[PDB]
Amino acid sequence: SDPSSINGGIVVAMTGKDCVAIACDLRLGSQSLGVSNKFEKIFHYGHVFLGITGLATDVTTLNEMFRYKTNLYKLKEERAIEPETFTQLVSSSLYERRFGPYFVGPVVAGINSKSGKPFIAGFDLIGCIDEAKDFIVSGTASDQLFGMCESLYEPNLEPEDLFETISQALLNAADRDALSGWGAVVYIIKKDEVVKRYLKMRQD
Amino acid sequence: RYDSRTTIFSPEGRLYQVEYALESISHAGTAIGIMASDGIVLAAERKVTSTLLEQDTSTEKLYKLNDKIAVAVAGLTADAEILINTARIHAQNYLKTYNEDIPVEILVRRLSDIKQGYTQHGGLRPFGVSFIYAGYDDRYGYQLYTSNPSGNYTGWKAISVGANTSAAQTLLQMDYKDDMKVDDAIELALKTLSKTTDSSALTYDRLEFATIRKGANDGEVYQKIFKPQEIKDILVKTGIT
Amino acid sequence: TTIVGVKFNNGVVIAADTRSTQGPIVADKNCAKLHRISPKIWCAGAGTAADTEAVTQLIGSNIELHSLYTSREPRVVSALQMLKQHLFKYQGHIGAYLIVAGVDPTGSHLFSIHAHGSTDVGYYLSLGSGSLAAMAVLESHWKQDLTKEEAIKLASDAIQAGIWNDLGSGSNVDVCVMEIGKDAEYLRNYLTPNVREEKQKSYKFPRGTTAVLKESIVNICDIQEE
Amino acid sequence: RYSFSLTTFSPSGKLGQIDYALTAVKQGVTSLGIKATNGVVIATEKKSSSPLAMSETLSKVSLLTPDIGAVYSGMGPDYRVLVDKSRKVAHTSYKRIYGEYPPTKLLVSEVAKIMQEATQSGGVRPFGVSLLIAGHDEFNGFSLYQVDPSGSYFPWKATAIGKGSVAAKTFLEKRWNDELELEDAIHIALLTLKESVEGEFNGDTIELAIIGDENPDLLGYTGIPTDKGPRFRKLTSQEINDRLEAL
Amino acid sequence: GYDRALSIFSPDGHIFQVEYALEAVKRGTCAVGVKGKNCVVLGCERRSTLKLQDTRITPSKVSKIDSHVVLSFSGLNADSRILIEKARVEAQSHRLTLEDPVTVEYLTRYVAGVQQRYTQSGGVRP
Amino acid sequence: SAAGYDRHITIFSPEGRLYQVEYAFKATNQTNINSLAVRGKDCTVVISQKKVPDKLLDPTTVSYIFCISRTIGMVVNGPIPDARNAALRAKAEAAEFRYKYGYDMPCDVLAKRMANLSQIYTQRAYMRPLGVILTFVSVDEELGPSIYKTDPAGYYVGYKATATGPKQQEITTNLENHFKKSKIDHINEESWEKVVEFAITHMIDALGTEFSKNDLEVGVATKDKFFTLSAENIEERLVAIAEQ
Amino acid sequence: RNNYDGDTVTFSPTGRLFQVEYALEAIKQGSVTVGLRSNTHAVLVALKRNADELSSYQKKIIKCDEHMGLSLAGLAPDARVLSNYLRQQCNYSSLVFNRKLAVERAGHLLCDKAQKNTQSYGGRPYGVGLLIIGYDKSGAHLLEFQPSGNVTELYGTAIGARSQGAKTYLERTLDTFIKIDGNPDELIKAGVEAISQSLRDESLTVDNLSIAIVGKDTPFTIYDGEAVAKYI
Amino acid sequence: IGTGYDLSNSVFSPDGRNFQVEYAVKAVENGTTSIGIKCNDGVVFAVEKLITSKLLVPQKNVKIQVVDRHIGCVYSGLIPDGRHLVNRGREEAASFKKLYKTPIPIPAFADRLGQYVQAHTLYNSVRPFGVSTIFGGVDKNGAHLYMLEPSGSYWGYKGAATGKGRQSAKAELEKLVDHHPEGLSAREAVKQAAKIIYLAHEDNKEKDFELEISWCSLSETNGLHKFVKGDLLQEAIDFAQKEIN
Amino acid sequence: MDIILGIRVQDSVILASSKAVTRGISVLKDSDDKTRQLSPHTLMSFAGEAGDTVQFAEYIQANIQLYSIREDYELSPQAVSSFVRQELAKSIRSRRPYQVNVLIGGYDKKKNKPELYQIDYLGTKVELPYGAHGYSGFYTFSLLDHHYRPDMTTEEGLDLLKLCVQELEKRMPMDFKGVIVKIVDKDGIRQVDDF
């Protein structure tokens, strides 16, 4: 189909009271052949965390690319980039190729340093800020994740409970998709601790 | 005469334009890099002060290049601006491509070539800025270099650029000890800036300072620009104030 | 989506739904579709969403810029031509469909502009997927002479109507009322026809219902040599 | 031969063009800025040079962004091109990379960078002016800065430039205090600038603007709490008068 | 004049900028080359000024162009850098094109070609 | 003095300003014409001497007032070569403006674009600066009566009334005297015709010369129209003065 | 003064440029040629000069096209350029317009070619004088091209060193060679006389004479060596 | 005048002149007399084409050149520089013809020429033009005659002159206005054009000249430009010969 | 068509490539080489489209060796595989579509361990200790991992590659006409004759 649908991978982020959660699968697929089960998809540049779903080649190159812009940012300003400001950077990079765009769907997660508000945003092929403070999903199982997350979600969650909510959301949805699953990983960003917790789970 | 173009040589078989640019660096203040096996101290002087000069909220003779290489600045700041920006861009261009931080040696080399090109080609001015580079890359540990205005580089274990070079150098090599310590190097720097600079008190707000240390974790380097009030505490310890 | 644009004697009202839909999955329930060009020229985005959101920002940089260069307020006509010539070059490969609405010292103005560059000037215009849906309330209750009070009512009944029949738009109705000589009042989440139905159960889980392979600490902050 | 291109240097260093460029600055009128702990006041004067010439068509105080204003001291015409460019780059280089109006330090550098290119070329004169750029952002606070003809910039607590530079500089040193409010700064600003011309002072001949608190009034729109009004504010002719009555 | 540019042939058929380039060489370090029958020794004077100079991280005056061709140089070190980089890039290119390693003759004729080109123009000195 | 720097515009003298650019202020009194423009109250008038040096010339070609666009006039003081060239850009720029920004182009903005262009010419040594002083006239879309003088440096400032030429000082003192004693910046005659008569009176007084009708060229910007008057249209105003 | 002769973008106070007059002088420094014509034939007769007597001359006639061709006088580097362009215009006319290009219009494009380098900095006015002969629809023509670009339709002219003596031979006999028609040999006889008066310290050889002829039914042909020994 | 300011056509003297631009008018003086006579229903161009010796081919050398087919130009000054300007004039006309589907108006033609000349006094690597062009014709706005100076400056003229004999020319031209306030209809202006070149030649009484008269006449060529040739020309010669003696 | 196989042991990378080149419906020559060495401790086995294999492999060979000479010290496997991904990433958005998939199996000297990467024709590098591409990976991703243990010796892993050859011969309908095996360790790269 779409090159984005072929390679696969899911990214889902969530909000709570002074916390955000962002999780991914570890699957790399090239068509039905599973390549890798242990390649992550979420990266981070500073304390702002980025996911990228879609075609693999653009997922690694766009990891490299946004790293590249944020490290210039950091040096210039003499401070780490904020999520709020990183959400615009993300749209700008995507819009720069309209008619040969990168096949990806970025998800931004963080919590601001200037206000401490929790922050999340969604993107698309050619990109725009798609604002919520509920949850953002992307990927091949994005349609499963969109309903599945909404039932489970409640607002004003504690960081430890927010983990329970995301974990459940991702695992069952992932399981019932062919091009996702295959191991997972979740980052819970409190404020100044990030705990990184890898989901033990059934293989697909 | 043979200042008239940059692309012409003198009958002596020097180039007056480059020599002249070298004299540009002696109308700006001293910068001292000392390498020690336990760290590099980077030291710089602010050549302009006043009592209304804001200088306590700013760094401007200390610029971080990436996460593991930083420079000290001596010369024209306008000259400095364009090359620092370019260097930052290339060093991190290497990061993207190769997925490793740039080796110290290659990035100086890149930047010294660009300097030679401005003399070699067109009707552009050569740049009268001497940068002391301090980095860490695994292939030679701590690495110190400094660059001439001509467009060439040499390694050092300690070096001084800026004004009153000849005197300053004299003072350093008299008091160097081959193993050294990171703390003893800082102390050596201050001793030297004190004497070359005519600001006898030699206060915190007249000093910029950065130390590069691997003490933060292992295999991981932390570059720490000293902030003004900290610069004031270490002058008490060395006794200057 | 759905846009309705309606003149009144002292101004203009532009309104739009808040539901962001990408395919037949609701992408965001609450997210504006009112984009601001200039402080008194506002617009609503439809069609392809990415193209609308981007192009008001790039075009808007110029409109703001001309305000600063000319030392004059920004005309709405300035915004229209810049769009019309912009979209024209790329021939609808930026698919961007805007109702531009605003006020000026020249009067109150309403335009629509289309992907290929075409202009519509009426006293009510509508655009979007629920263009057809919103139309019928607009035709049967637009009148010549409307006060502020009525016009707010004319837009809100039309966006609400287009919510019900058009399955593409839902959620809240956002209003921006633009009055001559005065600040433009953004009345977002005016009318609520989507009070989130509460759930029978709490789908909250015990603590250690998930099964976790290992733990780890990643740093998000600077290291220290101290 | 040492002084008579941008490309040439001297056996005493530097370029002739930077020394002369500095001279251009001092031919201008006196313009000054005083930084306070909650604001920055920016002031300049206008010399009409005829009663026929209007005072408002001269704009020596210009918003770069609606958080960062500037004045200049030097040649009038050069100012006008550089402000048009400053806006133009303000939007390009850091409002499609940052998507909101630049932090003070960044734009200072971008404006500085144009000056640097105008020194860099051989056959292109450097600017006739040095600016003061005063602005606000959250991260580095209120701030005030000088962009000199070279392509080089300096942050300042207070400074002045132009013709009245030697009298003004010595006043600014004596009279600055550790802590001060904006309101008090307006009065210190006014008193300093009056040194430069006597008996031709008044709030129509004095242009005065600030980067102080936001004004949600002049934001242009309402009902959106996350965004703020402009930090920049131009004081009117009646408002200058009120403040002048109080001295 | 008549030494003010390379585009002045001069009233003696000498290009002064070529002449002054030659005078430039003298300022650099001494270098000597001697062939055997199963070797070449390429030897150079190594400059000293201070014992705070590294030799650890710092270029030698000898640079490997490929793996069987080598280069030593004399003159301004700053100038030479660019010379050496080009000489190297071409030597690797040679195997891109033919799939052979470089010949010794090919290389020297090329490095003189690069300067000759520079000499020919008037905008750039060699 | 002379060295770098009355031979180049990219070479600053030790005064701080470029000498050659200043020579352009001495190159605008080579055609020996004087303009006086004043503002009405819903109109702007501009009047410049018409110099006929020989009878072999057509006398109606001999103008310096121009139609730039619908609502913009311009009078140029200084040499003809630079006049046409300045005027061409200005016409062209006025046209360019609608299509970018919509509506008609006001005076202020025309004057700003010409001022930046003038600065550009001084920035690069690739051209000389312009030898003409431009005084643009309009009646504005909402800001009404305007006179804008843009000098070849690029300095531009608006006016209550303005004068230009080798006898500039003399019409300038006559104006101060008039507006200061009445206390009004404007001229409070609410028809456009009687402002044009006042302009004719003032020029007569300052120069000390009475003028005939082949000796004045008269342009009038009215609100949302611009027209240049022909000699027999000038004649109604001249007989107005001559018998009050 | 003559401090003004170093740029071709600078005029004199006497209303000249110095470089263009100097380019005029450059013609004289070279070889000598005489052109003359009749209504049904056109002829150039040109002196070949050699560096030394082991040296074997310099070809002074360049065949343009089969209805036009030209001779040179002055500097050769200059001539090769001007000729090339002219040939290019004759081949362009023949391909696209199926025409033999008029001598008058062709000469006029050359005048326009000269001004292209005169105006612009760099390049120079060319330092060669060209005499172009041809036969078109309007019969035989002889044009005198100059460095300046002044183009002059003439019955006879001569350029190069000591060429004033050919114009004196041609001036006396002006009406006589116009009346010759149908006899190419006799126009050559007149030309041979002409170029005799131009010489000083020399005598005509079978390899000094190079005689170039175009007319009604005869295409352009350049006689050399053993084809100029009927008219030696 | 002084030293400096001369060398490059972009440098100003103190006086507010530029010596190079001045130097360009001086150059036209040495050139060969040109006149224009405007008329109520035509324009007449005449020029003095000097013949250096009796070797020249008569009537086969012209400085009168055409633009489109309704505009006359004749230049004085340097011949080939003059050609270049007329070349460009053809380019101006041709471009207008494509777009608007009509022959250039004369004020349109004057504007574009006047800019091209001005550009070549604007830069440092250009040279100032060395030619004047008396030019004009008849259009849909009646007859117009212009004279373009080497500076980039032009004005309209009822009767115009430039070249060596221009003092004799202007003097006569002025006379023409006094005797004829009606300005002379086109026929009699051919014959009259002749007499002016014959007078102008009493300052050019060195070598012979060839009288070439062309016209463009509303009444007598149908607004198109054509040369005056044959018996019309002869009549104009005979009148001029008579009245000079 | 064409196989490339990889398995990494505890001190070596064993890369293998098919001997056959089939252009047309005829096997173009039965025994060939089809691996080129980027660096003296980094090996690039390649397979893909016609003659794009060769040009790309020669392109990368020049450029990695260039850096090695300048620094005076060879690149690591992390850097080398990465370079190659950059190149592919340009090439798929370029008018010239390269369609070359490669395996980079090198010895990291500074780390002292083998590293085996799978780099796709699209431009995606992931470190994997059993990878392949084409329809090689369609049979042998399962087979390796079954008999593979974290620890191995070089003798085991070669014999396990022989096991994988056998599977391939039965159920893949393409002939390979044998396979070549070069072993990449710390002691360089050497040819070892195997079927």
Short mmCIF file of all heavy atoms in Angstrom, two decimals, chain H residues 16-33:
data_model
loop_
_atom_site.label_atom_id
_atom_site.label_comp_id
_atom_site.label_asym_id
_atom_site.label_seq_id
_atom_site.Cartn_x
_atom_site.Cartn_y
_atom_site.Cartn_z
N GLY H 16 28.91 69.48 -9.16
CA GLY H 16 27.65 68.83 -9.30
C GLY H 16 27.52 68.34 -10.76
O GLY H 16 26.50 67.67 -11.15
N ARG H 17 28.67 68.34 -11.51
CA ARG H 17 28.77 67.86 -12.86
C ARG H 17 29.49 66.59 -12.80
O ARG H 17 30.03 66.16 -11.80
CB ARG H 17 29.46 68.76 -13.87
CG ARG H 17 28.52 69.88 -14.39
CD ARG H 17 29.30 71.11 -14.91
NE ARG H 17 30.17 70.54 -15.95
CZ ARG H 17 31.57 70.65 -15.94
NH1 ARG H 17 32.10 71.26 -14.79
NH2 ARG H 17 32.39 70.14 -16.88
N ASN H 18 29.53 65.90 -13.95
CA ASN H 18 30.27 64.65 -14.14
C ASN H 18 30.85 64.88 -15.51
O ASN H 18 30.09 65.09 -16.48
CB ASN H 18 29.22 63.45 -14.18
CG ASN H 18 29.87 62.05 -14.20
OD1 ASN H 18 30.94 61.80 -14.76
ND2 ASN H 18 29.30 61.07 -13.41
N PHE H 19 32.19 64.96 -15.56
CA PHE H 19 33.03 65.35 -16.69
C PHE H 19 32.88 64.39 -17.87
O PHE H 19 32.84 64.88 -19.02
CB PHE H 19 34.44 65.57 -16.19
CG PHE H 19 34.68 66.69 -15.18
CD1 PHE H 19 35.95 66.69 -14.69
CD2 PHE H 19 33.74 67.65 -14.70
CE1 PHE H 19 36.31 67.64 -13.71
CE2 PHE H 19 34.16 68.59 -13.81
CZ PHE H 19 35.43 68.62 -13.24
N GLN H 20 32.78 63.10 -17.60
CA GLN H 20 32.53 62.10 -18.59
C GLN H 20 31.28 62.37 -19.42
O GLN H 20 31.24 62.12 -20.59
CB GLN H 20 32.42 60.70 -18.03
CG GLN H 20 33.68 60.07 -17.37
CD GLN H 20 34.77 60.08 -18.35
OE1 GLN H 20 35.86 60.61 -18.21
NE2 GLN H 20 34.39 59.50 -19.57
N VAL H 21 30.13 62.81 -18.75
CA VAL H 21 28.81 63.09 -19.38
C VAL H 21 28.94 64.30 -20.25
O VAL H 21 28.34 64.25 -21.35
CB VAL H 21 27.66 63.32 -18.36
CG1 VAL H 21 26.34 63.76 -19.01
CG2 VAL H 21 27.61 61.85 -17.75
N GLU H 22 29.68 65.36 -19.80
CA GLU H 22 30.00 66.54 -20.47
C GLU H 22 30.79 66.23 -21.68
O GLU H 22 30.56 66.70 -22.80
CB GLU H 22 30.82 67.54 -19.64
CG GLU H 22 31.15 69.01 -20.14
CD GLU H 22 32.64 69.00 -20.37
OE1 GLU H 22 33.40 68.91 -19.38
OE2 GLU H 22 33.05 69.26 -21.53
N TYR H 23 31.83 65.38 -21.54
CA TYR H 23 32.68 64.84 -22.61
C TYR H 23 32.04 64.12 -23.76
O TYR H 23 32.60 64.19 -24.83
CB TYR H 23 33.72 63.79 -22.13
CG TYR H 23 34.86 64.44 -21.31
CD1 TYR H 23 35.77 63.58 -20.70
CD2 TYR H 23 35.00 65.83 -21.09
CE1 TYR H 23 36.74 64.11 -19.81
CE2 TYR H 23 35.97 66.35 -20.18
CZ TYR H 23 36.86 65.43 -19.58
OH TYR H 23 37.68 65.81 -18.53
N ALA H 24 30.90 63.55 -23.55
CA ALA H 24 30.05 62.94 -24.49
C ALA H 24 29.37 63.96 -25.45
O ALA H 24 29.43 63.66 -26.65
CB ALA H 24 29.00 62.14 -23.73
N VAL H 25 28.81 65.17 -24.99
CA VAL H 25 28.33 66.24 -25.88
C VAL H 25 29.46 66.81 -26.81
O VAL H 25 29.23 67.20 -27.98
CB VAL H 25 27.90 67.42 -25.08
CG1 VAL H 25 27.17 68.44 -26.03
CG2 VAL H 25 26.91 66.90 -23.97
N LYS H 26 30.71 66.89 -26.24
CA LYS H 26 31.80 67.46 -26.93
C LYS H 26 32.20 66.72 -28.17
O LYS H 26 32.56 67.30 -29.20
CB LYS H 26 33.08 67.62 -26.08
CG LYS H 26 34.21 68.46 -26.64
CD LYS H 26 33.95 69.99 -26.69
CE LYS H 26 35.24 70.65 -27.25
NZ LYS H 26 35.03 72.07 -27.52
N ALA H 27 32.13 65.38 -28.05
CA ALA H 27 32.31 64.39 -29.08
C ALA H 27 31.36 64.49 -30.25
O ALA H 27 31.78 64.18 -31.36
CB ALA H 27 32.32 62.98 -28.44
N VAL H 28 30.11 64.90 -30.11
CA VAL H 28 29.05 65.05 -31.13
C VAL H 28 29.39 66.30 -31.98
O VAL H 28 29.04 66.32 -33.20
CB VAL H 28 27.74 65.30 -30.53
CG1 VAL H 28 26.69 65.32 -31.70
CG2 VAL H 28 27.45 64.06 -29.59
N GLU H 29 30.05 67.30 -31.38
CA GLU H 29 30.40 68.54 -32.11
C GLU H 29 31.21 68.28 -33.35
O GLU H 29 30.97 68.89 -34.38
CB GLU H 29 31.12 69.58 -31.30
CG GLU H 29 31.13 71.05 -31.86
CD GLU H 29 31.78 71.96 -30.83
OE1 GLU H 29 31.39 71.80 -29.61
OE2 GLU H 29 32.61 72.83 -31.19
N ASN H 30 32.16 67.32 -33.32
CA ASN H 30 33.09 66.94 -34.36
C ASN H 30 32.34 66.15 -35.46
O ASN H 30 32.76 66.12 -36.64
CB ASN H 30 34.26 66.10 -33.87
CG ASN H 30 35.11 66.89 -32.90
OD1 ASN H 30 35.62 67.92 -33.32
ND2 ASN H 30 35.25 66.38 -31.65
N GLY H 31 31.23 65.56 -35.14
CA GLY H 31 30.31 64.87 -36.00
C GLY H 31 29.66 65.87 -36.97
O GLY H 31 29.84 67.06 -36.83
N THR H 32 28.96 65.28 -37.97
CA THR H 32 28.43 65.90 -39.13
C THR H 32 27.01 66.28 -38.96
O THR H 32 26.24 65.46 -38.50
CB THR H 32 28.63 65.21 -40.48
OG1 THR H 32 28.10 63.89 -40.41
CG2 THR H 32 30.13 65.15 -40.79
N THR H 33 26.71 67.59 -39.20
CA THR H 33 25.46 68.25 -39.09
C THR H 33 24.18 67.44 -39.43
O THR H 33 24.11 66.74 -40.44
CB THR H 33 25.55 69.54 -39.89
OG1 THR H 33 26.82 70.11 -39.78
CG2 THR H 33 24.42 70.49 -39.41
#
